[PDB]
């Protein structure tokens, strides 16, 4: 029984180090692979926090610590239930992977290159801006891949799980060689 | 007693919980008082990560674990050592406390209401968009306070430790009476 059992310090050390790397050599949604990994770390954080409080409850020094550790664990796992319900409801309205994510319950859908590109959205305002840099399209903080200005979509949609909003392309401009700028305005609102 | 390590479980329980709260309630900047706090936390992940690896190099289980803990601590040291070098050099050009943030090395300066508003900018590109919602200005993810479209600045600047860029107001439009939209195009580049 007289063991150190302190190897968890290496486990937590590496976990913190992973967070530093994600926020330093990635952070920005430059590609889908890094973004997906970041979303996983933002998910696993839930059971890790929960476990920390549970251990305090199990090896509690006294009943005061026990009661507190249990109450704290009850909150962290009370929120996870929420993360789920909201994600499930979004999924039920749509039919895509992106419906399950810790950041937001609103999706942006932009038709490109013969198909539709979907990303999580943290906005849903009257006006959505778009910027084209060296032939690449960037919207709402996400890279949507290659798209020239002359072929920029005239319609995009946003799904909030309660309502469906349709946006229409307004004025657009070219700003040097293959760069430019555009904006979308809500034109219609439908309900689910 | 066994070092009453249950206390360390409580500390990490609370520290992790802080990130769960910040990333759910203090997202997308918005309130300057939440943003300025979030920036504090990230500045205390280099000493926490380091302490975890350093402590493990004292309470060693074996030589292999010790060697790894030391190597990892060394790497975490080199991270904090860059943040300090980069921040001081930026400060030398732009004498503002915003130069000491643990996110980026670029500052955005937008003149408003008789003064100049400064915020961290994630990247410097040819075109910077601006959105006005119900009389409030949002640029590069930051809220810069109240600004009507008719009062929108004709020039903004972006400063780094090496160069200085000036952006000229280009196109603008009113959308929905109170809301509106504009874009800024880089027109001049300077050095230092």
């Amino acid at each position, epitope marked *: 029984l007289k063991q150190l059992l302190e190897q968890w310090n290496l486990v937590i050390g590496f976990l913190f180090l992973a967070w530093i790397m994600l926020l330093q050599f990635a952070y920005s949604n430059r590609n889908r692979f890094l973004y997906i990994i970041k979303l996983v770390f933002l998910w696993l954080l839930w059971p890790v926090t929960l476990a920390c409080f549970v251990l305090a409850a199990v090896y509690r020094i006294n009943w005061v610590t026990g009661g507190i550790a249990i109450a704290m664990a009850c909150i962290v796992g009370l929120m996870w239930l929420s993360y789920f319900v909201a994600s499930f409801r979004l999924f039920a309205r749509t039919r895509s992977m992106w419906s399950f994510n810790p950041e937001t319950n609103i999706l942006l859908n932009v*038709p490109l290159r013969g198909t539709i590109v979907t990303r999580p959205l943290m906005e849903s305002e009257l006006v959505i801006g778009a910027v084209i840099i060296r032939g690449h399209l960037r919207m709402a903080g996400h890279s949507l891949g290659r798209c020239d200005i002359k072929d920029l979509p005239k*319609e995009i949609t946003v799904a909030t799980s309660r309502t469906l909003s*349709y946006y*229409k392309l307004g*004025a657009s401009q070219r700003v040097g060689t293959d760069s430019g700028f555009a904006a979308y305005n*809500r034109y219609r609102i439908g*309900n689910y | 007693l066994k070092q009453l390590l249950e206390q360390w479980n409580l500390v990490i329980g609370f520290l992790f919980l802080a990130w769960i709260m910040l990333l759910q309630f203090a997202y997308s900047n918005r309130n300057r008082f939440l943003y300025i706090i979030k920036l504090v936390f990230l500045w205390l992940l280099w000493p926490v990560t380091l302490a975890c690896f350093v402590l493990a190099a004292v309470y060693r289980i074996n030589w292999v674990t010790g060697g790894i803990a030391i190597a990892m601590a060394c790497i975490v040291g080199l991270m904090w050592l860059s943040y300090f070098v980069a921040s001081f050099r930026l400060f030398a050009r732009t004498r503002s406390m915003w130069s000491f943030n643990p996110e980026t090395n670029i500052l955005l300066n937008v003149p408003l209401r008789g003064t100049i508003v400064t915020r961290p900018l994630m990247e410097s590109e040819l075109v910077i968009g601006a959105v006005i919602i119900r009389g409030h200005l949002r640029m590069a993810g930051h809220s810069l306070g109240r600004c009507d479209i008719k009062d929108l600045p004709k020039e903004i600047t972006v400063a780094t430790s090496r160069t200085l860029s000036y952006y000229k107001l280009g196109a603008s439009q009113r959308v*929905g009476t109170d809301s509106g939209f504009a874009a800024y195009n880089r027109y001049r580049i300077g050095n230092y």
Partner: antibody, heavy 113, light 112 residues
Framework: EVQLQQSGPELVKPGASMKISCKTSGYSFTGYTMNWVKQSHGKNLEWIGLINPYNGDTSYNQKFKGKATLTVDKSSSTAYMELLSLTSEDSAVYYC??????WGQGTLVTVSA | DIVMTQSPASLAVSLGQRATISCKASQSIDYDGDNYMNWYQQKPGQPPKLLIYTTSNLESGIPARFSGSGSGTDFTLNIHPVEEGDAATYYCQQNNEDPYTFGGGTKLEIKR
């Protein structure tokens, strides 16, 4: 640039059914919604329904429900409206529209013996 | 089942004079403080075209002579420098609710 070519006029008896075939071109077939209008005798615009050619997910109002079926054929870049149990009040100029901008030329439907 | 009506049945307007068409809604819309209302134009033998969207956003390709405004339940279409080519039927659409509805249509005639 963008076209919405109609199949042309047709005449049927009461109780008959038909399919209105709209052929488009100039853009990728999917990615934009489709809307139908009736414009009945006289000068009155009306909304029949909306569909998403990418995956279905149709939506109708409560008055035209059961009177029409809206479908799509991705292989020919077309969209169809199936007219059910046509009566004397169904004679009209039917046509497709995309985003309140582009319209078809009009398919004249006459219901009469 | 949201009813919209226009006040005039038709207008008789001389060249160079302002023409106006008004419309009222049974509902205030009020979505995040924004009202919705589209205005359309139709000529004989042709499908309609959109002129104005969301109460005030002029459609591209439409001349500035067409100025839309209003708020709440009161919507107005103002055509100031009326010309000889402005001879068409104008319509309203709410563009806010699942049972989308249109107005009755107002006919513009030009005096000569």
């Amino acid at each position: 640039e963008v076209q919405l070519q109609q199949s042309g006029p047709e005449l049927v008896k009461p109780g008959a059914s038909m399919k209105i075939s709209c052929k488009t071109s100039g853009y990728s077939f999917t990615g934009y919604t489709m809307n139908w209008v009736k414009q009945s005798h006289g000068k009155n615009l009306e909304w029949i329904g909306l569909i998403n050619p990418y995956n279905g997910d149709t939506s109708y109002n409560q008055k035209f429900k059961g009177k029409a079926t809206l479908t799509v054929d991705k292989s020919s870049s077309t969209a169809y409206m199936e007219l059910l149990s046509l009566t004397s009040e169904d004679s009209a100029v039917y046509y497709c529209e995309v985003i309140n901008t582009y319209w078809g030329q009009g398919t004249l439907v006459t219901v009469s013996a | 089942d949201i009813v919209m009506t226009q006040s005039p049945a038709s207008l008789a307007v001389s060249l160079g004079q302002r023409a106006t068409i008004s419309c009222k809604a049974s509902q205030s819309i009020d979505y995040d403080g924004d009202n919705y209302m589209n205005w359309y134009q139709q000529k004989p033998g042709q499908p309609p075209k959109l002129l104005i969207y969301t109460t005030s956003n002029l459609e591209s390709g439409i001349p500035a002579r067409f100025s839309g405004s209003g708020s709440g339940t009161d919507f107005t279409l103002n055509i100031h420098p009326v010309e000889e080519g402005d001879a068409a039927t104008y319509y309203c659409q709410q563009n806010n609710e699942d049972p989308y509805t249109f107005g009755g249509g107002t006919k513009l005639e030009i005096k000569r």
